[PDB]
A paper describes a structure:
Thioredoxins (Trxs) are protein disulfide reductases that regulate the intracellular redox environment and are important for seed germination in plants. Trxs are in turn regulated by NADPH-dependent thioredoxin reductases (NTRs), which provide reducing equivalents to Trx using NADPH to recycle Trxs to the active form. NTRs are members of the family of pyridine nucleotide-disulfide oxidoreductases and contain two Rossmann-type domains that bind FAD and NADPH, respectively. In the NTR-mediated reactivation of Trx, electrons are transferred from NADPH to Trx via a tightly bound FAD and a disulfide bridge.
Here, the first crystal structure of a cereal NTR, HvNTR2 from Hordeum vulgare (barley), is presented, which is also the first structure of a monocot plant NTR. The final model of HvNTR2 contains two molecules in the asymmetric unit, covering residues 6–323 (chain A) and 5–323 (chain B). As in other low-molecular-weight NTRs, HvNTR2 forms a homodimer with each subunit having two domains: the FAD and the NADPH domain. One FAD molecule with well defined electron density and B factors (∼40 Å2) comparable to the surrounding protein is present in each subunit. NADPH did not fit the excess electron density in the expected NADPH-binding pocket. Instead, the density fitted reasonably well to a citrate molecule accidentally present from the crystallization conditions (real-space R factor = 0.7–0.9). The overall structure of HvNTR2 is found to be the same as previously reported for EcNTR and AtNTR-B, but has a different relative orientation of the FAD and NADPH domains which would interfere with NADPH binding as defined by the structure of EcNTR with bound NADP+ or AADP+. However, the relative orientation of the two domains in HvNTR2 is quite different from their orientation in AtNTR-B and other low-molecular-weight NTRs in the FO conformation; the difference in orientation of the NADPH and FAD domains can be described by a 38.2% closure, a 1.0 Å translation and a 24.7° rotational twist. The distance from Cys148 to the nearest reducing nitrogen in the iso­alloxazine rings is increased from the 3.4 Å observed in the structure of AtNTR-B to 5.9 Å, the solvent accessibility of the FAD molecule is increased by 450% and that of the active-site disulfide is increased by 66%. The smaller rotation of 49.8° compared with 65.6° indicates that HvNTR2 is actually closer to the FR conformation than other crystallized NTRs, which have all been in the FO conformation.
Author numbering:
A (entry chain A): 6 to 323
B (entry chain B): 5 to 323
Write the structure that this text describes.
Amino acid sequence: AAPLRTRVCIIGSGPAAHTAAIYAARAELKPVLFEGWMANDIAAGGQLTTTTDVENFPGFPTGIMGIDLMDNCRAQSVRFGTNILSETVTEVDFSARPFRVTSDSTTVLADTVVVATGAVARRLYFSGSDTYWNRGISACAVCDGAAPIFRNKPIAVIGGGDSAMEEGNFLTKYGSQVYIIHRRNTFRASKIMQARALSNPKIQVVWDSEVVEAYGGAGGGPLAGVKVKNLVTGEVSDLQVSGLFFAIGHEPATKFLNGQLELHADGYVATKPGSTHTSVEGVFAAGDVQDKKYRQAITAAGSGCMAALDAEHYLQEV
Amino acid sequence: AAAPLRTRVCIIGSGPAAHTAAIYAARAELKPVLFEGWMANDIAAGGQLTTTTDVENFPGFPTGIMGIDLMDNCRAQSVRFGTNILSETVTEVDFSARPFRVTSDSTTVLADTVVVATGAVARRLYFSGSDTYWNRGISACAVCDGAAPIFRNKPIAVIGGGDSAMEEGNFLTKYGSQVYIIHRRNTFRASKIMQARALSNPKIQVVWDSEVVEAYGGAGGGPLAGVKVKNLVTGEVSDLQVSGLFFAIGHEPATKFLNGQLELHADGYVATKPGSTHTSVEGVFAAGDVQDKKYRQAITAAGSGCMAALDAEHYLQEV
Ligand SMILES: Cc1cc2nc3c(=O)[nH]c(=O)nc-3n(C[C@H](O)[C@H](O)[C@H](O)COP(=O)(O)OP(=O)(O)OC[C@H]3O[C@@H](n4cnc5c(N)ncnc54)[C@H](O)[C@@H]3O)c2cc1C
Ligand SMILES: Cc1cc2nc3c(=O)[nH]c(=O)nc-3n(C[C@H](O)[C@H](O)[C@H](O)COP(=O)(O)OP(=O)(O)OC[C@H]3O[C@@H](n4cnc5c(N)ncnc54)[C@H](O)[C@@H]3O)c2cc1C
């Protein structure tokens, strides 16, 4: 009954959301941003808070920790007038204008909305997966591959996408042998990507299989092996390995929208290519919630900028 | 769906409780159908024990046994006696009618009795740094990991305000140099006794009205080194050096799927008739951590699963 009214409501708190906030606020639109309260089991600030060392975000010659970069983006958004609610959005209503955005505690009436809730890397929860997390297992092959523990030892990658093919190749630069493990006998990845990996000397595919257990050594040591179950024969085999990486995609954060935006089948928001426009006039989508191809902080930042300008431009025509 | 499995006893869950219930139901020739989940609730079939490495207090194993192996044995045992195990997660039940209807994505079972044994899952927070330093300082099992070298003689933090937080705090002062309980309020939910035994502890310091907003490491990409704590009154944020941080903020009983059809306590646990597995619905039983927040052991949960089988067997005979 006491709804905040704003020209621009931003949902999410990664690089996209914050770049959008910076431009919307500087354009004197007084944006309200919902940064979440551990929304989606990711801290406000977004995926970057789950990594330690960001080296490819332009402007930081020495690199910068994700948490610090995102601390900066938020301080910047606040500095220009962004009103940040530390609340998770649970529901929207895009059938009427102004649009309604609500959390547990707050209700906002917004002339435009930027959806920038991002995505989260997918993992499995087979026996041993929590146990050996950061002690062999990880969901970022590229983050951790170089690391000593894996050098010259065998690595496993689970997945059947383009990501799995490329992370597999990437890992054969550090490991002694790489195993791609996939549930089916056929890859979802492009025919090209399948070939570049299948042609790789240090990669061996393990079709028709699932990992059913990860175990360690010692002495409570780090990851030492995985039990793999063939899904045709039923047979279970030990497979020695110092690393296991998840390359099974990313889960775009769109369930809260309850279907009110047109999505692709993988759940990402369908945008007008080369803009942030969605299926609903006045609602925009920026960042990883609508990009599975690049998935970078820098691209997502760019997209957030675009979402602000698009919204600003849509306000002017209305 | 239109080809429903019919059974005297349908068991939902795959921990010690479910499997002991299966072992008894199957041996009593009741041909139980068990839904072990497909990573239901983001825990492997086998249950919480699959998230630990060394179980030392389950009677019968003088040398200890790894959780995964123990639960591999329970399952092989359930199968050996005829249990039909679906590797599927239950999404919905119907307890308004008999036989009871239990369904997963793929299967529908019509059951004369149901044993709910879906257990629980330790709660955690997802502040910045929490995934990062998981197993590299941060953990949800103070008692599992406290002894470990990394923590010896260094400062530890515990988050929570329950009886568990008080006791895990005390337990940690045996290994650390100093222990900090961190809680959102200025008052503890724990019993007045427990609050006193911790507040009286020399090596424990409480950090009221606070939240952890970040965990950071050292080096060189080293292990947990500190946490940023935010006071919720003043707003101030402070660095607090620490080699370990443990979650003692309770357990989440796996009862949402029941969608209200069993009477729950406010914390979500299934309300059972004390000293049995009887629930608010005749013919439906609850065993294990899904209805026990007090003991929470594999051995007690096993005992309770046995009870659920015999209770159901006894209820079939009177019906
Ligand atoms: C391990 C790892 C390492 C990475 N390293 C790099 C790197 O070195 N360089 C690089 O460029 N990129 C890196 N990335 C990728 C980068 O994190 C993402 O590409 C980028 O963060 C996408 O940002 P986004 O703005 O789309 O939001 P995200 O970072 O995905 O954040 C979305 C945020 O919105 C919040 N939210 C979600 N739902 C709601 C809701 N309903 N209401 C309110 N808030 C909500 C979430 O809590 C989340 O904090 C890495 C990713 C990972 C996982
Ligand atoms: C890290 C850790 C270490 C521990 N170490 C010990 C120890 O050494 N000794 C000890 O006695 N106790 C220990 N415990 C506690 C012990 O594991 C639990 O008390 C015990 O497992 C409770 O078992 P349960 O049978 O009630 O169900 P749980 O083990 O909680 O299992 C429930 C299972 O059912 C499945 N499930 C849930 N919902 C559904 C659904 N809807 N459909 C299908 N399947 C579903 C889940 O996937 C899960 O596998 C430990 C706990 C933890 C977390």
